[PDB]
Amino acid sequence: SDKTEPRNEVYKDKFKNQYNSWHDTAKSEELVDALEQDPNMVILWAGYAFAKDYKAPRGHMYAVTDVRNTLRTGAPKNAEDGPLPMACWSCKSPDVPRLIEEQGEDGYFKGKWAKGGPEVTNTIGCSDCHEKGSPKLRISRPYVDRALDAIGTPFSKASKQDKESMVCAQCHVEYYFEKKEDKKGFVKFPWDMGVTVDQMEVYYDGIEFSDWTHALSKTPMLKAQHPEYETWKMGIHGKNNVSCVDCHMPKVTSPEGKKFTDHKVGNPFDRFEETCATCHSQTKEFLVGVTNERKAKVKEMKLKAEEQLVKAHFEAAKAWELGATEAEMKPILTDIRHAQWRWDLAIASHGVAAHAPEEALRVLGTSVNKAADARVKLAQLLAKKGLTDPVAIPDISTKAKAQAVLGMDMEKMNAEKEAFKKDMLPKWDAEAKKREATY
Amino acid sequence: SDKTEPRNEVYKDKFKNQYNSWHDTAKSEELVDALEQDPNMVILWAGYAFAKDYKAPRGHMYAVTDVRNTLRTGAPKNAEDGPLPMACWSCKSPDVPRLIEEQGEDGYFKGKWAKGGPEVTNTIGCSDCHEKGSPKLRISRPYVDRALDAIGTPFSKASKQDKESMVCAQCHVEYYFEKKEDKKGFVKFPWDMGVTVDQMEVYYDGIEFSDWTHALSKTPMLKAQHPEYETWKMGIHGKNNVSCVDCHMPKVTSPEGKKFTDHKVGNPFDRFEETCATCHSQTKEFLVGVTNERKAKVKEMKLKAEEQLVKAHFEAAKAWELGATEAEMKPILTDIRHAQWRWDLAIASHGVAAHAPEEALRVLGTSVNKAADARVKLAQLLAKKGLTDPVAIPDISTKAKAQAVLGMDMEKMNAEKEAFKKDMLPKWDAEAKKREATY
Ligand code: HEC
Ligand code: HEC
Ligand code: HEC
Ligand code: HEC
Ligand code: HEC
Ligand code: HEC
Ligand code: HEC
Ligand code: HEC
Ligand code: HEC
Ligand code: HEC
Ligand SMILES: [Ca+2]
Ligand SMILES: [Ca+2]
16 A cells, blocks of 8 residues: 555564564464353353354464454455454554555455455554554554544654553454444444543443344343553553553663564563663562452452342343333343443453552442342332342353353354355455565 | 650650641641542441441541531530540540550549540541650550550560551550440450451451341441551552651651641641652552552442442341241352442542552452352342342432431431530649649
8 A cells, every 4th residue: 555554474573573572462362262161151142143252362473363363353245244243353454554445444344244355365464553664653444543632642643652651552442343434334333422431331321332232131232342541541551641651561672782662462460670660669579460350359349240240141131031111121221231231341451450440349339239229129019020039150161061051052063164164264365465475 | 754755845846847747737728528429428327337337538637626516426415424435535635645644544444435525636646656755656545555465566676667557556546445344334345366358347246246236137337436557558559668657747848948747747748748749659649540540440449339238228128018037048148248248348438449449349259259249149138038129229428418327317416416515624724724733
């Protein structure tokens, strides 16, 4: 393109060190089946693509295999097969700013996932955060800019230290999918109101948005996704503009002598003597062991906010199954909507504990003061509908008992996924070999 | 007798720095009626001491003025009288070690409150932290050094920072008088498990202790009384050995030029240098935004905890009035005791917004999660009992409107105290100067 290059090896030389640390984002390769880890989420996302494959994020060289080989996109056969629209790339490849340059936005967006599938082939790449070649940094998706001009802080008109955290937040944020036909599958950041879990919840609620309808309690359920920049602005780090780069891209020196920026983006503790060493008088073993303590006072309340949530869908699933009305089930599924939305947001980023854990726990607190306002109103209605006992909760100890409790054909899913893994995928990588070897 | 000195005023001249600062705790008379400002404590401390009178904690020259006055203490007619016992003078004056060091603890706590009326007069001061004349921090109390010996850190160990925060730890702690016949009336701190909210729970339980049986929900209630050390131990500076002295007793520089520790104990922002300045490099008002944002996240979740509890107490007098057996209301009532305990600890130290906020929020979170399990249990139960429309809560909007909901004659509580504040108090102040003549 005029503006965007996606072939990531053109810069292996002429940016020698900065390239090979960007390859060290293949130094973190581990499927973390967080559906087998916390099988109480199979049951809370009861009726979404998440009941099928949630994983902790791994390296940055895997953004393209993973967005393919996750059970959340199935075995498509045609260029509209597959449930999820195109825009499920967006945050995986410089083959996204490339194709927003070449067809406006709309030409990228409208269309199912696999249609543009043989066109995204590079992993997360250089011209994503940077200009073409140039050492400068750009925003290479136009919604991200449109989204800043809603919170207050335009890219070019905001300090270098501001920008340090930005280009991290073209991707790592929370997003819906614009339901109008003129925006048929755009990405868009729900900031507009603000970014407290309270301000977002009030936004979506104006536009009665639903990512799905809870296939257990029939609640208009919201799905929080990677709220990184959005929680980072609440932690006393980001209260003083500790950049996203200041920790996850630590400006190191070469064996030889000159300073670059390490482009491996892993755990800032792999480069402690380099990241959080530089702004502190502490030791590691002290600071790491204190982050592993926050990483568990967030863990415990994450669970005793789910146990009231499972115990509520089923305390609502019964409420349906005695025939309650819409009129009756209104302000219950209002509460369950909110109570689970707060639970998702507070811990939909795997580092709210590191980044802003004070706000983690207040959110998780109001995700229970709501679930309460539900399970009270769900048992008072189970009374005036003739139940006075409490509802049972079947064996959801494994992922495979909780997945199978939903009548899911998790076999026909796996069957076709590693079928299409070894059937279409050879083509997408080959048909793109064709064109993208001609520049 | 030898090691104490009740008049800290006898050293006014060898230390005018250490005494004219010490004396400025009296430049602090903001008395806020924390029941005029939350009628939902009234209901939560229903049938207990602080149903009558809770106040702000003002400066130290008032503790023997405040504890002579807080309607909790009541109106003894002689000194075989009084609602409360000895161990209330424990933390309110220097006359206190002068009593254990004349006869021992047996001889102290075995008594009524107004038994030792005109024996404790001089308000808080020197020999409560010091060796008579010596500018050194001894532990004036013995129940302290026995609890400190039960957490593995007696006073001898104590790197000079540990020490520093231990002499605040004799009075700024969570305490219970003991019930058992042989250690009867003695103060005891519940650290045997111990320091944390969860660790004082296993203790206060396994041993079957109960500050009072609630008058609405007929719960065996628990009081949580101003724990600073324990919350402070969990806060970030706690984990960095940043003694209570740094923030509240900075080293203010003399008018002559000396550099003496400030003995006016109060605010770290009525001294933003010497305090926060020696560590954190931001403006006085940036670091004041935080501790207030952090203060009113707790205020939101604290109130959204009393939110449930106040309901669940009335949700329990009905289920009693609708006639329940003891055997029904059993686990429902232990949850209540577990809710309004974790809540009360989370928010008893008039500034845990500042010390560990993250821990008050997790603790405040567990409260609402534990009140939540109770109300469903109360919901199903009141349902089998002919109640299905939700339990109604009456106007409890002011102190004096909620105080008169629990039936309380504040005139025959104010009248009996406007005589005790007029008669039997300059009658103690009389024999004060008499017993203080023999010095
Ligand atoms: C040693 C363990 C401490 C004791 C005992 C107390 N604190 Fe603190 N302190 C600090 C701040 C920033 C505040 C904010 C005051 C407010 O806005 O309410 C406080 C306040 C208190 C209070 C309440 C104040 C009042 O009643 O007006 C009490 C009872 C109290 N402190 C006791 C700062 C710090 C600090 C700096 C890191 C430390 C180590 C402590 N406080 C520790 C103690
Ligand atoms: C810019 C807003 C970012 C982004 C996009 C991320 N961070 Fe952080 N983070 C820091 C530390 C010490 C951890 C602990 C890691 C662990 O315990 O495993 C994290 C956590 C993350 C993760 C999860 C790691 C993983 O493998 O998933 C991610 C994806 C992440 N962060 C992205 C340190 C900091 C930090 C200091 C508190 C700041 C500021 C940032 N990171 C900023 C960002
Ligand atoms: C930018 C706004 C993104 C869009 C649009 C989509 N994803 Fe993403 N993805 C993004 C981030 C910041 C991360 C890592 C953080 C995390 O908490 O996971 C990911 C990761 C994934 C993964 C791997 C983990 C997993 O869930 O298995 C998958 C499979 C994935 N993303 C799929 C996916 C789909 C189906 C999308 C369309 C809804 C999609 N992503 C959009 C950033 C962004
Ligand atoms: C987004 C996740 C990035 C990817 C992928 C790559 N880089 Fe990058 N790089 C990124 C940022 C936000 C910065 C900070 C620059 C600054 O000083 O503000 C950098 C650093 C650079 C620079 C300039 C400064 C430096 O430290 O070297 C250049 C010229 C650079 N990186 C080049 C580069 C190339 C060629 C990459 C593909 C191999 C690459 N980076 C990966 C963000 C991201
Ligand atoms: C869109 C191209 C992204 C941009 C720009 C940034 N990140 Fe991201 N990241 C993205 C995805 C889709 C994933 C999923 C990983 C997977 O394969 O499932 C990730 C992952 C991370 C991780 C985890 C890395 C690890 O070793 O586990 C981190 C720490 C991370 N991302 C941080 C991060 C930072 C700090 C960024 C600004 C430089 C950044 N990312 C940009 C997508 C995208
Ligand atoms: C300079 C750019 C910093 C780096 C690198 C890290 N932190 Fe930090 N931290 C910084 C500031 C300005 C503050 C505010 C306190 C102050 O002294 O002004 C902090 C505060 C913390 C906290 C407490 C609050 C929280 O968000 O949990 C922690 C736990 C903390 N810092 C830890 C930490 C660690 C382990 C780091 C390396 C990964 C780290 N910080 C980086 C500035 C900077
Ligand atoms: C028991 C003898 C105490 C010891 C030891 C310390 N304090 Fe105290 N403090 C005590 C009482 C009974 C009160 C309230 C008095 C009243 O009239 O209501 C206080 C008050 C404070 C305050 C608030 C003072 C103000 O100006 O508002 C603070 C900030 C405080 N206490 C802190 C503190 C510290 C850090 C101590 C150890 C150095 C300490 N106190 C000792 C009782 C006792
Ligand atoms: C030392 C372990 C104490 C004992 C025993 C008692 N209290 Fe005290 N009190 C103490 C502190 C550290 C504070 C400040 C925190 C707060 O919540 O205010 C207080 C506060 C008071 C006050 C001021 C207003 C009020 O809280 O009602 C009074 C009047 C008071 N305390 C009196 C009092 C009584 C009657 C006690 C026996 C039940 C008692 N205190 C116990 C420290 C300690
Ligand atoms: C506990 C609440 C205290 C009471 C009561 C009094 N002071 Fe104190 N003293 C206190 C602290 C925290 C320290 C710090 C020791 C250090 O190393 O900094 C001290 C020390 C002193 C000193 C030493 C001089 C100095 O370094 O400031 C003196 C002369 C002293 N204390 C005298 C003193 C007097 C006369 C008091 C009654 C008017 C008094 N102290 C009360 C804490 C406490
Ligand atoms: C040196 C003795 C300190 C004084 C005086 C104060 N603080 Fe502190 N602070 C100190 C340390 C060693 C740390 C750990 C992280 C770091 O590397 O600096 C902190 C951290 C904070 C935090 C964040 C965590 C929290 O408990 O909320 C805040 C908000 C903070 N510091 C502010 C603060 C204020 C307002 C102070 C005056 C009362 C203050 N600190 C005193 C060290 C020291
Ligand atoms: Ca969304
Ligand atoms: Ca108690």
